[PDB]
Each structure stands twice: as structure tokens, then as C-alpha cells.
Design an enzyme around this catalytic site. Structure first.
Site, short mmCIF file in Angstrom:
data_model
loop_
_atom_site.label_atom_id
_atom_site.label_comp_id
_atom_site.label_asym_id
_atom_site.label_seq_id
_atom_site.Cartn_x
_atom_site.Cartn_y
_atom_site.Cartn_z
CG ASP A 111 5.93 5.65 -7.02
OD1 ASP A 111 5.15 6.19 -7.84
OD2 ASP A 111 5.87 5.84 -5.78
N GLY B 83 12.41 10.19 13.36
CA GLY B 83 12.53 11.12 12.24
C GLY B 83 12.44 10.35 10.95
CB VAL C 272 3.37 0.69 3.88
CG1 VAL C 272 1.84 0.77 3.89
CG2 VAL C 272 3.90 0.08 2.57
N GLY C 273 6.28 2.38 3.32
CA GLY C 273 7.73 2.27 3.41
C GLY C 273 8.40 1.38 2.36
CE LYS C 274 4.86 1.32 -2.49
NZ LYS C 274 4.02 1.83 -1.36
CE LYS D 42 -3.93 2.14 2.55
NZ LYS D 42 -3.30 3.49 2.46
CB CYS E 129 2.88 6.56 21.91
SG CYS E 129 3.82 7.56 20.78
#
Ligand code: ADP
Ligand code: ADP
Ligand code: ALF
Ligand code: ALF
Ligand code: MG
Ligand code: MG
Ligand code: ZN
Lengths: 302, 31, 293, 35
Positions: free
Chosen positions: C53, C260, C25-27, C22, C229
């Protein structure tokens, strides 16, 4: 100065086409659901349609009910509907009404089918009063928004091939329809593109380039939602405080870069935002700006 | 400023920022 | 099933490694990380990271400019990146079509051509190709269209040079469907939208005979070791329990949300270690605060 | 249990979860358990 909300758009009586776009995962679907809810609640006499052009649809998943190729009312709304464009079905229907499998999985077919849906509305124009698009992430949405041009040229070229290889009526109909769309898409009072981003380098830079690309197509953009903000200056842990320091660094650049835009700052909530109730609660802050001092408890109210 | 006046002004200012070499400049300030 | 990608990182067979899932997400973050780990682990081999991409982020991730022609990552001897600008590529082919440069699907077409180009160079014993290509893919929906292409095309199919393309399509299909040669690494976050999308993605990939044996669960809070959190961790944990059950036959690699963004070779390298040796919140906790600029 | 044997066992297991209605069952498990 420029109000930090989307009130003007939410109460617009001119807009027919509202795109919600930006980088993956920034909150396009969440925001587009939110804007649509706000528009429908603010304008009870108008009919709104939220269309997903992301081939990986999430409207059903966000609202927790089943939408599909045929527009359907959102449960609990009198004047909002969702549609998730369905390529298999769309091509099955074309095939029946006149291969359809193999073209059903050709890259580009999603943008093609989404645009065809826009064309159908135009032809009925001559419904829903306003259409909101929950778009695919940046890269492929630009291809969709290039279509009016890409298409008028292809159709022109298609006509040239036909002349050489020994119907003109239908090409002209098609071309005329594309032109109407180009005209409406480039009319600031009829269409706007709301960008969504998060306050991080990768999103910010992509958003600037997206906006430049949009302006060069003569597409209006006057609004930017900055989503998932921590506001950790308003019991916050070491992680939240460091991350908020990062978010603020980019928020400062955003304030300068987009001083002429409505910049709408939205909080990261204490859970995912799904279902009509929670989406509505969240959506209020697009209309009346979130104030971290006064509204802070809402993020726990999902 | 009226509602309509503010709208036209901002439209023009937004446009001006990307005009000529504005766009290229904006990219550099980000990078 | 070990909670890491060590087997993949040290593989001596893989030529094609897709990284997908998706949006957001961090691809890109994960694909850089996987690529760094492999290059560090296999100095004798040359790795290419390619972004499919159309909204490219490899240049933004590393903080230097890449393009259609491969360029080594600064500070590595054996990792390169590629980001194709369809308008440029097409102009170079024309010199060696602005219609085509903005046709939806043109991105997947050129990404596919690049794959075909690499296959050909290898079959022809060109001394300078890469050993392994990692794909930083677009979000789910369009990545599926890309991966559907070998077959979709295989069906679709001077006519000789047409059937020459046929044979290439078949060669790609053969390799993409070989678990020694090709694998697809899913990335997700522990939230319903991402979870459901990931399962659907995997069910599609498996129906394509594409190997999927690993999943990265990113941006995890591990808060049990700040009310926001604490509440968000409770949510993540609920889906994490579902993930553990669903993917018990998979490598499930759990990655922490860092304090970060993760950009630049040093930071990505530091993150990447936890794809190789699983992150331990109690032990490695300090690391999420060690990102530089 | 060698790594070769384990690799083969895990692979067969993965495939089996998606066979014979197992696929739709898995989806129902995800949606069914969500709010
Ligand atoms: N401000 C927010 N606070 C909390 N969760 C959010 C917020 N905005 C989006 N989400 C969640 O983050 C994830 C990504 O949002 P989503 O709308 O799917 O993104 P996009 O449609 O751009 O891919 C979803 O799980 C959604 O519930
Ligand atoms: N574990 C993490 N901790 C902190 N920031 C992260 C983490 N994983 C990804 N990011 C950041 O989150 C954003 C989305 O990640 P990215 O790799 O661009 O996603 P995708 O390529 O799937 O769109 C980027 O700003 C990236 O730096
Ligand atoms: F938003 Al992305 F890869 F950059 F999903
Ligand atoms: F990941 Al999305 F719209 F669901 F960018
Ligand atoms: Mg979405
Ligand atoms: Mg990416
Ligand atoms: Zn916190």
C-alpha cells in the site's frame, strides 16, 4: 468560527472539480455520492458528473443501478450523472481508432486513463458544469494528482528522445492541455479536495500526511468529513461507549489540527447506506450539520 | 467580517499552519 | 473446513502470503496478526512483512518507524517490516529519476523489484534472507494490477540482461501459481460492498491461478451475545449467511470488532490468537475489552 | 479421511464452483439477493 458543514461548497457557483479522497473504507464513495446529490438538488440548473477513479468501482453498487464508461443519469435525478472509467474498453477503443490488452493491465494505467478523461473535458471546455471525483484510496490518488507535473516532464523528455532519434505539434497540444489542468487544479475557487476520515489513529495520521502532500501541490483543501461517528453520549452498549471514548480522543485532536477547516461530523448509521433514497437522507447532514440530540432517529431510518 | 473576508482569512491561516516547519510539527503532535 | 488459519500459520512451504481486499476492512491489522502468529509459531524462521500500500500503515500499526530497508519489530526476534518510499529507493539506485518516482505504477514496479531481489538472493544462497514474506497489500483494484504484473510483463517481453529479467518474471510466475508456495488471504467485512468486491477479487485471483483458500470476516459485532448494534448485527448476519454458503469450501475466519483500535505488538498479538484458534463470542467475549495503549 | 485427502477434496471443490458459468451464477446470487 468555521461552519461544521459543506454548505458553502454545496452552493458553490465557481467549483468545476471536486475530489473526495482519503484512507480506504472511510466513506469516500458514500460521501462523494452524498455531496453530488446535495449539489444537484441545490443547483437544479447545473449539470453534475460523479466520476469514479477507484479501479474497484462502487458507484453502480452504491446507487444500485448500472453505470459504465459512458456517463449516464442517476435514476431519480435530472442533473446528476455517474461514470465508471473502463480501461479495457478505453484501450479497445484506442486500438480500434488507430497491445491494448497488455497495456490494459499495467500498474498506473488506471490513473493514466482517469487523467485522460479529465483531458477530454478540458478540450470540450474549448458538457457538465462540475465534476466530482470518487477517488481511489489515498496512496494511488496522490499519484493521480501528481500527474500534471509528472506528465509535463515526461512529454518534455519524450520530445528530447524524438530529437535524438530523428509530432512536435501534438506534443505541444498535449502539454498545453496538461497546463490548463494544472492551472485549474491549483485554483482554489475552481478545485477543492474534500478529505474523508474516521476518528482513529491510522486514518487521522494518513489524513494529515495526505493534506500536507496536497497543500504542497498547491491543491486546495478546506473541508474534512469525519465519518462513522458513534456519538455514544447521546441505551449505548459497553462496546459503543469504549469506542466512542476512542473516537472522542481523536475528535479532540481533529478539532485543534483542523480548526481552520470545515469539519463535518457524520454518524454511523444502523445499516449500510445504499440507493438514492438513503444516500439523500444521509447527505442532508453535509449541508446542515448532524445534531445527535435532534437528528438521532435518522440513523435507524434506512 | 464579510463572506469574502472570512474566506481569505481562513485560506491564509490554513496555509500558515503548514508553512516553514509547521507541517513537521503537526506530524510530531500526532505521533 | 476449520474456521481458522492454523494450517497456514504452521505451514512449512509458504514463501509468499498476500493479504488483500476492499479498503479499510483490516488488511494491515490482519497481515500483522498473521505475521505475528507465524513468527511465534516458527521461531527458527525469519518473516518479513512488506507493505505494498503506497499509503503505508505498518509503522502506524506497530507504533514505530519502518522504511525501505528491513527492520525487526521491537519485541520480536524473527519478524521484520518494510515500507518502500519509491523516491528514496530510486535515489539510492541512482547513487549506487524524480520523473520516475511519481509515475503512476512506480509503486507496483518497486514492490515487484523487491520480490525479484528476494528470489535472486535465495537462488544465490545469501545467508540472510527471509523464509516467508507476507504482503500487506493496497485495496483491491491496484492489488489486482500488481498480481497481474508477472503475466502482463511476461507478455510485454544488453538484451541478454533483458531476457535475464524474463527468466525472473517466469520464476515469480511459477512460484505465485504454486499453492504450496503462495496463497492469497482475503479480508472483508459483512456488508454488500465488501462482499461483492471480495467475490469479484477471488474470481480474478483464481483466473490468475493464484491459490485462495481462506477468508477473514472482520469487525463482526456478534450482538446476540444497544439498538444500533442490534440493527447492524442483523445486517452483518444477513451477509454472513451468504458468506457461509459461498465460501463453504474455504477457511472462513470470523473476527470481532474490538472496543478500540488495534495497535502495538501486545494488542495485535492478542487479536491474532483468534486467527489460530477461532474466536468464541460466549467464551472469549471479555477479550474485545482487553486492549492496552 | 486424512488431512491430505481433505485438502485435495476442498481444493477441487473450490475450483469447480468457479467453472462452467458457476462464476457468473455466484455473482448473480450476490447482486440478486441484495436490496
Ligand atoms: N456513516 C456511515 N454509516 C453506516 N455505514 C456507512 C457509513 N459510511 C460508509 N458506510 C458503509 O461502510 C462501507 C464503506 O464505505 P464506502 O463508501 O465504500 O467507502 P470508501 O469508498 O472510502 O471505500 C460501505 O459498506 C458503506 O455502506
Ligand atoms: N476487528 C477490529 N476491531 C477494532 N478495530 C479494528 C479491527 N480491525 C481493524 N481495526 C481498525 O480499523 C481501521 C482499519 O483497519 P486497517 O487494518 O487499517 O485496514 P485496511 O489495511 O484494510 O485499510 C484501523 O483503524 C484499525 O485499527
Ligand atoms: F485503507 Al487501507 F490498507 F489502509 F485499505
Ligand atoms: F474500499 Al474503497 F473506495 F471502496 F476505499
Ligand atoms: Mg469507494
Ligand atoms: Mg492497510
Ligand atoms: Zn452498541
Amino acid at each position: 468560527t468555521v461552519e461544521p458543514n459543506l454548505h458553502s461548497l454545496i452552493t458553490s457557483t465557481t467549483h468545476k472539480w471536486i475530489f473526495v479522497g482519503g484512507k480506504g473504507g472511510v466513506g469516500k464513495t458514500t460521501s462523494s455520492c452524498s455531496i453530488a446529490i446535495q449539489m444537484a438538488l441545490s443547483q437544479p440548473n447545473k449539470q453534475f458528473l460523479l466520476i469514479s477513479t477507484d479501479p474497484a468501482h462502487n458507484l453502480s453498487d452504491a446507487f444500485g443501478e448500472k453505470f459504465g464508461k459512458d456517463a449516464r443519469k442517476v435514476t431519480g435525478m435530472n442533473n446528476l450523472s455517474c461514470m465508471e472509467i473502463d480501461p479495457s474498453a478505453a484501450l479497445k477503443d484506442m486500438n480500434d481508432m488507430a497491445l491494448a490488452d497488455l497495456t490494459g493491465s499495467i500498474p498506473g494505467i488506471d490513473e493514466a486513463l482517469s487523467f485522460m478523461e479529465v483531458m477530454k473535458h478540458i478540450k470540450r471546455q474549448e458538457t457538465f458544469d462540475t465534476v466530482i471525483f470518487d477517488t481511489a484510496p489515498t496512496g494511488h490518488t496522490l499519484r493521480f494528482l501528481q500527474l500534471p507535473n509528472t506528465l509535463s516532464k515526461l512529454l518534455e523528455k519524450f520530445g528530447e528522445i524524438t530529437n535524438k532519434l530523428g509530432i512536435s505539434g501534438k506534443l505541444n497540444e498535449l502539454k498545453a492541455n496538461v497546463e490548463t489542468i494544472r492551472q485549474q487544479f491549483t485554483d482554489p475557487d475552481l478545485t477543492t479536495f474534500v478529505c474523508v476520515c474516521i476518528s482513529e489513529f491510522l486514518s487521522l495520521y494518513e489524513t494529515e500526511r495526505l493534506i500536507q502532500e496536497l497543500i504542497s501541490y498547491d491543491m486546495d483543501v478546506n473541508s474534512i468529513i469525519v465519518n462513522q461517528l458513534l456519538f455514544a453520549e447521546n441505551h449505548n452498549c459497553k462496546r459503543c461507549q469504549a469506542r466512542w471514548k476512542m473516537q472522542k480522543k481523536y475528535l479532540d485532536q481533529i478539532d485543534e489540527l483542523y480548526e481552520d477547516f470545515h469539519v463535518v461530523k457524520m454518524p454511523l448509521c444502523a445499516g449500510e447506506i445504499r440507493g438514492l433514497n438513503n444516500l439523500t437522507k444521509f447527505s442532508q447532514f453535509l449541508n446542515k450539520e448532524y445534531n445527535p440530540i435532534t437528528d438521532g432517529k435518522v440513523i435507524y431510518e434506512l | 467580517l464579510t463572506e469574502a473576508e472570512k474566506r481569505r482569512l481562513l485560506r491564509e491561516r490554513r496555509q500558515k499552519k503548514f508553512s516553514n516547519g509547521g507541517a513537521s510539527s503537526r506530524l510530531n503532535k500526532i505521533t
